[PDB]
Amino acid sequence: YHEEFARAGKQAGLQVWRIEKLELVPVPQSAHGDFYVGDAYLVLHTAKTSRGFTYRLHFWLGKECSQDESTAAAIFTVQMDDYLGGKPVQNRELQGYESNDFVSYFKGGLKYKAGGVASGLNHVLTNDLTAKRLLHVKGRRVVRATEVPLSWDSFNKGDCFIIDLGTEIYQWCGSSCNKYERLKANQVATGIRYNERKGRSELIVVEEGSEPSELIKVLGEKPELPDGGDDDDIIADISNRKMAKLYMVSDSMRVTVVAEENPFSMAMLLSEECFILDHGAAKQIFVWKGKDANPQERKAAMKTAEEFLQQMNYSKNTQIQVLPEGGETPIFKQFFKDWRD
């Protein structure tokens, strides 16, 4: 019913919408990758196949968005899903914990902008040039630029920071950060100048201990810098250990174990029921919904999955992927020894 659903999934490519006071508002192509820290988004990826149209539906939740702001995103995803006839694959995306597939849609990386709809902020593209902000650039695999308070308190020796003053962008490189971190932060700074300023802006690379007068004017005198925190985010352990479990959901919700170790057999998946493939140790849980399974139980898959994490004492930041029968992902299918299409 909401106007945009009519625009959704018509042709191949990526479509980003931001939930603005219970309404779907498109996010322009240039703004793709920028997400407000206090907002909820809907990301739809359309793939053309011979005949077929394959959908990868994602709902991104901001760190500062409310419980009710999060609820609206979940409803919109359910409405979008049945609007697309239960053909799409749904994913709950959490800020700083989003999946590889979601991450792969934005080549320049992710930009976490402070504020949101409550601060009156828009994705409406502007020449701008009046901007004053600070971006903390972190991550080796995935480049994440986070909007941090524009002061020396945010700073650390081991990382790269981008001071965006509008007409000029400063790439502050910490004394103890390597070549890879410098290049990645540069790509973000080049991204602002070209994408947001149209190349009018000027890029100045700044070294710690050598900051210009303009920088120390806004920021003030530079004090001692804390040693760069080593994030060393958890990386999947490679072994011959079979860490996945197969569960069947029996309506609150009751989980019954099907298989105590992967590889699973395709026959275990019954069209009459909803299943949970647990790979919680590797940060991923999958909700497989049978074609002849109860429709009310199918719609509550996201809620069922969140309850599963809580019951099995997993982190609330575990990746949730909801799959319809026949719309299984290559990652889900590979847990099976006898997968047949």
Residue numbers in the entry: 6 to 256, 260 to 349
Give the text the authors published on this PDB structure:
Adseverin (also known as scinderin) is a member of the gelsolin superfamily of Ca2+-dependent actin-binding proteins, which regulate cytoskeletal dynamics by severing, bundling and capping of actin filaments. Adseverin is composed of six GH domains (A1–A6) and shares 60% overall sequence identity with gelsolin (G1–G6). Adseverin was first identified in chromaffin cells of bovine adrenal medulla, where it acts as an actin depolymerizing agent that disassembles the cortical network of actin filaments in response to bursts of intracellular calcium, leading to exocytosis of secretary vesicles. Both proteins are able to sequester two monomers of actin, as well as sever and cap actin filaments through distinct Ca2+-induced domain rearrangements of the two halves of the molecule.
We crystallized A1–A3 in the presence of EGTA, revealing a compact auto-inhibited structure similar to the conformational state observed in inactive full-length gelsolin. Purified recombinant A1–A3, supplemented with 5 mM EGTA, crystallized in space group C2 and its structure was solved by molecular replacement using the structure of G1–G3 excised from inactive full-length gelsolin as the search model and refined to a resolution of 2.9 Å. The domains adopt the compact arrangement characteristic of inactive gelsolin, with A1 sandwiched between A2 and A3. In this inactive conformation, the long α-helix of A3 is kinked to enable the formation of the A1/A3 latch, resulting in the masking of the major actin-binding interface on A1. The structure appears to be relatively rigid, with B-factors indicating that flexibility is limited mainly to the extended A2A3 linker and the short α-helices of A1 and A2. The inactive forms of A1–A3 (iA1–A3) and G1–G3 (iG1–G3) are highly similar with an overall root mean squared deviation (r.m.s.d.) in Cα positions of 1.19 Å over 337 aligned residues, highlighting the structural conservation between gelsolin and adseverin. Interestingly, comparisons with full-length gelsolin show that this interface largely buries the surfaces in iA1–A3 that bind the C-terminal half of the molecule, suggesting that the crystal environment partially mimics the inactive full-length protein.
